Amino acid sequence: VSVNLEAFSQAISAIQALRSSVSRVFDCLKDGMRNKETLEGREKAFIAHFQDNLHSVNRDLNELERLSNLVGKLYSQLLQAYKWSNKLQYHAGLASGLLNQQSLKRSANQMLVLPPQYVDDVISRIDRMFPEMSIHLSRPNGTSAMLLVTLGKVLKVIVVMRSLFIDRTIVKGYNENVYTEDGKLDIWSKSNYQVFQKVTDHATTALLHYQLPQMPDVVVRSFMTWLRSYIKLFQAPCQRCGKFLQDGLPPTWRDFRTLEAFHDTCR
Amino acid sequence: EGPASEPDEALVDECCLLPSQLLIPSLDWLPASDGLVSRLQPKQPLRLQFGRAPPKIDHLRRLHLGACPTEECKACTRCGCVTMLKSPNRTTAVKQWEQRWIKNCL
Ligand SMILES: [Zn+2]
Ligand SMILES: [Zn+2]
Numbered sequence: 353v354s355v356n357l358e359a360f361s362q363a364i365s366a367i368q369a370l371r372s373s374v375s376r377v378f379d380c381l382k383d384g385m386r387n388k389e390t391l392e393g394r395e396k397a398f399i400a401h402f403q404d405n406l407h408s409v410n411r412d413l414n415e416l417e418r419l420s421n422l423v424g425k426l427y428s429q430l431l432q433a434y435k436w437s438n439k440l441q442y443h444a445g446l447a448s449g450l451l452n453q454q455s456l457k458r459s460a461n462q463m464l465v466l467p468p469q470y471v472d473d474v475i476s477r478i479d480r481m482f483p484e485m486s487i488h489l490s491r492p493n494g495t496s497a498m499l500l501v502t503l504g505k506v507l508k509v510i511v512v513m514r515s516l517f518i519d520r521t522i523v524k525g526y527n528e529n530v531y532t533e534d535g536k537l538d539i540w541s542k543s544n545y546q547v548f549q550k551v552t553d554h555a556t557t558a559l560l561h562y563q564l565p566q567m568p569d570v571v572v573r574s575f576m577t578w579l580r581s582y583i584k585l586f587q588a589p590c591q592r593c594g595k596f597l598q599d600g601l602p603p604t605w606r607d608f609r610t611l612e613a614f615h616d617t618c619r
Numbered sequence: 620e621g622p623a624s625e626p627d628e629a630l631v632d633e634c635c636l637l638p639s640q641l642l643i644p645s646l647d648w649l650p651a652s653d654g655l656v657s658r659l660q661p662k663q664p665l666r667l668q669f670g671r672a673p674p675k676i677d678h679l680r681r682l683h684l685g686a687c688p689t690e691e692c693k694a695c696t697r698c699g700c701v702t703m704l705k706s707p708n709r710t711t712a713v714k715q716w717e718q719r720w721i722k723n724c725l
Contacts, residue, residue, distance in 0.1 A: 384685015391689070 356423055363419045370412050377405045460565070466516050468495050474569055475499070482580065492536055500530065500537065503583055510537055517568050518559055518575075523548055551582075551604050561608055581611045588613050647678060653699040677703050679720070695724040 380401065387394045472489060475497075479487040488500040496519065498512040508530045512519040524530060524543045532538050543549050558578060562571040582604075589596050590603035591612050603613035652658075659665055675684055678700035684690070695702040702724060706717060 384683075384687075385689055386685065386687040387689055388687070 356425065359419065359423045363416065363423065366412060366416050366419065370409065370416070373405065373409045373412055377409055380405055468497060471497055471513065471516055478573055478576065484583065485580075490537065498537055502526075506583060506585070509579075512539075518572060521555055521559070521575075523552065523555070547601065547604065550601070554605055558608075578606060578611065581606050581613075584613070590614060590618055592618050645676075647676065649678065649698060649700060651699050654696075677701055679703065680706070682707065695720075697724055700724055 385394065385398075468491065475487060475489055484504045486500075486502045489497050490499070491497050496512070496514045498510060498519075501507075501509040501511060503509070505526055507523055508526060508528065509521065509523045510530060511521045522541070522543065525545070525548070528544075530538060543552065559571075559575065562574050564571050585604065586602055588603070590598065591614065593603075593615075596602040598615045598617055601615060603615055603618060605614040605616060605618070606612060607614060607619070675686065675688055676682075677684065679702060690703055690705065692701045692703040702720060706712060
């Protein structure tokens with residue numbers, strides 16, 4: 353356990369700060385006087401500093417017991433070869449660096465085929481968690497995969513891929529026939545809802561926002577992570593206007609890199 | 620009567636038993652050369668100015684003060700010891716040890 357082993361740090365610092373502060377109380381009163389020209393700038397500062405250091409000792413004493421309340425509670429030769437592997441984890445963090453994703457790219461101008469089973473292995477990696485959502489991969493038309501996604505009791509989404517990249521994505525509710533009369537997945541239709549049609553535009557702006565020229569897996573992973581915030585729809589008020597409805601519209605627009613529900617007017 | 624005798628080392632080792640108990644509190648060397656005795660030289664004058672002036676314990680009484688004390692003194696100009704002016708105790712005061720240097724220092 354480490355909650356007590358790190359909560360002890362404040363108390364073990366506070367007792368030494370008590371020793372140092374009472375030493376200050378002793379020697380500052382033992383320092384005598386430093387007039388610095390006028391006496392009224394000293395003798396009125398005498399009671400000021402005498403209150404200051406004594407009250408510092410007092411507040412240190414006081415904050416000692418609120419930390420004390422929250423806390424609770426071959427022989428040494430082979431011990432040395434144990435923690436070095438644990439500090440090798442820090443050594444892994446030694447060469448990380450904070451440069452991360454950001455680079456200094458210029459223009460990319462000078463002077464392919466992948467199996468659908470690779471797409472299936474891609475979709476199997478992230479479907480394994482988030483059990484409230486489901487993924488149903490299908491290719492009734494060509495090698496391109498379009499997927500049915502159910503979101504608890506809320507949303508039914510068709511997500512069309514092509515050429516291993518993104519093609520389209522249309523979201524509807526939970527009580528509609530997303531299939532056709534023949535039973536195939538619907539391709540060209542409309543969600544028949546003002547809020548859903550409004551947020552499909554946000555989805556189209558988001559798919560053109562996540563731009564990786566080589567790595568579309570993180571593009572679609574960030575897309576579905578963004579979509580995961582939309583299971584909180586009709587349940588969270590807007591962050592700037594307080595109320596849900598802006599002209600009758602609840603907040604939906606999650607901002608880029610900061611996922612919280614907004615409107616177009618609410619930015 | 621006029622011994623000129625160096626005390627024996629038997630006294631020296633017994634005085635080396637002194638730091639086992641007693642350590643030197645402090646001293647007060649009077650001859651602080653604030654005068655021009657250790658500042659000037661023939662054919663080497665110093666063109667002085669006014670007011671440029673190129674642990675504070677009273678030299679007479681043994682009352683310890685602060686770093687920058689407040690009590691005033693009369694300037695014993697002959698050797699620079701702080702002949703401090705207004706003695707802390709007056710209703711019960713020695714009337715000759717203060718009055719011998721009520722004027723100046725020796
Ligand atoms: Zn709003
Ligand atoms: Zn003197």
